[PDB]
RNA sequence: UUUUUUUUUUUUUUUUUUUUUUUUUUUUUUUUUUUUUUUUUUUUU
């Protein structure tokens, strides 16, 4: 491949495209440099006054992100949560035996000295502090994520969750579209508060305040969609993580899988820092996103769909991947699992069935080598039977959105 | 067999330099069911050429 | 920028010449090879007239 | 008398944006827009 030459006049041309660094950054390789996660809670002045500052601010206007952060740290400074056994992640120790650790038992550090209105606001607001207001501020991060009319349908479920022995009402009025509370998403410190809340209550699921989770849940495995799609594939095929791995049939899907399965990342750990790698600022480019696993995402989600996933219907179709090559791979996998039913007797009454009892006939089971051999003998082209399988799978899908894998798949297979 | 130019050119020769009816169906399939496409694009060009 | 609008004076009513250039780029043939595909007396005539040295 | 691209130049040319993302997915739940007291033709003598 090294040398390419123009055949008309025997001259050497060198083909080359622009660079593309922008590489991934693993959770582990971060704690190699620093031992703590900096939480810059700027002002540490008057906690009762802050309650009024955020309340009147949110009631239409520009409430300071610095303000709400100062509030949340004061309101959630509950040193609750009796540690069940032991808690350790990436080398950083957090808990032992019967420790009584709170929610901010990772780094706090003070910052700046510029504040807005000055001192005691309006003493209007009673306690009802920890009870619902923190839920809301955290709940706006969930609403802020999206950008389609789903906002006025997810903010609806915000207001109805602040009634758990509370029942108040609402606060702002302006439509979202990224302008009001959406600023907060790009705040290193705010996101750190949300991630520490989700993590604390993922450990302390039984806790009373664990209701704060829904609203802060969308942070666990943010930008880790590829990993989720790999789990989904195992559930939908019913195969093991090892078997599924062997069904990867494209070079650039293999690369991506390898990238995702790097050995020292604590991705299979119960209560780790890994799922909050983005919001805790541990990584500037997730190894686990769809963006950095485009071949795998498309392949996995296409197969998933042929196998009757309802999730996959609406997955994004990535750019700059070998659709043709990827799609025929996914088809073989789906056709194989869809043919070979598991089906074995489970229970009996002393009366068992034992399994041992035309030419272009597909292989017995779900082994890759058997199917690979079968595909060769099929001229490396998908049969009429599997094309008809793919049709049946995609037709009668209804109202599929533009640029989804569902739209790709129906359009490819149902002419 | 593979994706090699010399080989595919030799096969094109064997088809007296004109695209096969299976080739035409391949491009047909690839272009039919393309939605609203604007004027003077290679999208519009390809559907006109291959979808008839 | 004064060209916008002053540009339609360039090759004003020399369209036949322009279609000869265009015919080359579409057929991708040489100028002389396109000339040889002219098959009607009155098209040869016009070509001679258009190419006078 | 004309002229005979409802062509036009200056680069250009995804009604492409990269900041990271990407089920108009969140499940704490829990999922017949089932429910119990008989009953069970919008049956009558």
Looking at residue A97, which CATH number applies to its domain?
1.10.3570.10
Long-range contacts from A178-187, C-beta under 8 angstroms, 24+ separation: A178/A144, A178/A147, A181/A140, A181/A143, A181/A144, A182/A144, A183/A65, A184/A65, A184/A68, A184/A140, A184/A141, A184/A144, A185/A141, A185/A144, A185/A145, A187/A65, A187/A69
Cβ-contact A414, A395 below 8 angstroms: yes
From CA A310, how far away is CA A303, in angstroms rounded? 12
Using an 8 Å CB-CB cutoff, list chain B residues near A400: none
**Total domains, chain A:** 2
**Which subunits count as partners of chain B given 3+ CB pairs below 8 Å?**
A
Stated resolution in angstroms: 2.9
Residue A7 within a domain:
no
Protein-to-nucleotide distance from the CA of C12 to the C1' of D3, whole angstroms: 9
Give A149's contacts (C-beta < 8 A, 6+ positions apart): none
Which nucleotide across the nucleic acid strands is nearest to A286, CA versus C1'? D20
Domain of residue A263, CATH code: 1.10.3610.10
Structural domain range at position A80: 36-218
Q: Given A186, A218, A250, which residue is the final one in a domain?
A: A218
From CA A292, how far away is CA A229, in angstroms rounded? 13
Phi, psi for A277 (deg, rounded to 5): -60, -35
Q: Given A218, A236, A260, which residue is the final one in a domain?
A: A218
From CA A298, how far away is CA A252, in angstroms rounded? 12
Residue A10 within a domain:
no
Three-state SS for chain A is CCCEEECCCCEEECCCCCCCCCCCCCCCCCCCCCCCCCCEECCCCCHHHHHHHHHHHHCCCCCCHHHHHHHHHHHCCCCCCCCCCCEEECCEEEECCCCCCCCCCCCCEECCCCCCCCCCCCCCCCCCHHHHHHHHHHHHHHHHHCCCCCHHHHCHHHHCCCCCCCCCCCCCCCCCCCCCCHHHHHCHHHHHHHHHHHHHHHHCCCCHHHHHHCCCHHHCCCCCHHHHHHHHHHHHHCCCHHHHHHCCCCHHHHHHHHHHCCCCCCCCCCCCCHHHCCCCCCCCCCCCCCCCCHHHHHHHHHHHHHCCCCCHHHCECCCCCCHHHHHHHHHHHHHHHHHCCCCCCCCCCCCCCCCCCCCCCCCCCCCHHHHHHHHHCCCCCCCHHHHHHHHHHHCCCCCCCCCEHHHHHHHHHCC
Asked if A235 CB < 7 A from strand D, the reply is: no
Nearest CA in chain B to A376: B1
Kindly state whether residues A351 and A270 are assigned to the same domain: yes
Count the neighbouring beta carbons within 10 Å of the beta carbon of residue A339.
Answer: 16
Kindly state whether residues A186 and A251 are assigned to the same domain: no
Kindly state whether residues A288 and A169 are assigned to the same domain: no
Q: Given A196, A218, A240, which residue is the final one in a domain?
A: A218
């Amino acid at each position: 491949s090294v040398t390419v030459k123009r055949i008309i006049d025997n001259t050497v041309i060198v083909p080359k495209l622009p660079a593309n660094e922008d590489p991934v950054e693993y959770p582990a390789d971060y704690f190699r440099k620093s031992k703590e996660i900096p939480l810059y809670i700027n002002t540490t002045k008057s906690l009762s006054d802050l309650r009024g500052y955020v309340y009147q601010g949110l009631k239409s206007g520009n409430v300071s992100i610095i303000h709400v952060n100062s509030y949340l740290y004061g309101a959630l400074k509950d040193i609750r949560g009796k540690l069940d056994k032991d808690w350790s992640s990436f080398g950083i120790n957090i808990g032992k035996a019967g420790d009584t650790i709170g929610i901010f038992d990772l780094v706090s550090l003070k910052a700046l000295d510029g504040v807005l209105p000055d001192g005691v606001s309006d003493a209007s607001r009673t306690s009802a502090d920890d009870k619902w207001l923190p839920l809301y501020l955290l709940g706006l991060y969930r609403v802020g994520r999206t950008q389609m009319p789903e906002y006025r349908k997810k903010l609806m479920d915000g207001l109805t969750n602040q009634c758990k022995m509370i029942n108040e009402q609402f606060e702002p009025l302006v439509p979202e579209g990224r302008d009001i509370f959406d600023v907060w998403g790009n705040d290193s410190n705010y996101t750190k508060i949300v991630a520490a809340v989700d993590m604390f209550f993922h450990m302390f699921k039984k806790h009373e305040c664990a209701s704060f989770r829904y609203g802060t849940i969308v942070s666990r495995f943010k930008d880790c969609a590829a990993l989720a799609t790999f789990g989904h594939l195992c559930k939908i095929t019913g195969m093991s993580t090892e078997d599924v791995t062997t069904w990867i049939l494209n070079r650039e899907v293999a690369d991506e899988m390898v990238q995702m399965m790097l050995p020292g990342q604590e991705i299979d750990k119960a209560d780790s820092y890994m799922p909050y790698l983005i919001d805790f600022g541990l990584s500037s480019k997730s190894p686990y996103s769809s963006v950095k696993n485009p071949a795998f995402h498309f392949w996995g989600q296409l197969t998933a769909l042929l196998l009757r996933s309802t999730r996959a219907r609406n997955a994004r179709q990535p750019d700059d991947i070998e659709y043709t090559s990827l799609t025929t791979a996914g088809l073989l996998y789906a056709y194989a699992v869809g043919s070979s039913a598991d089906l074995a007797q489970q229970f009996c009454v002393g009366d068992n069935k034992y399994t041992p009892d035309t030419t272009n006939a597909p292989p017995q089971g779900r082994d890759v080598v058997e199917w690979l051999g079968w595909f060769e003998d099929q001229n490396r082209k998908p049969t009429p039977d599997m094309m008809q399988y793919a049709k049946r799978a995609v037709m009668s899908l209804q109202g599929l959105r533009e640029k989804t894998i569902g739209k790709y798949a129906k359009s490819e297979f149902d002419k």
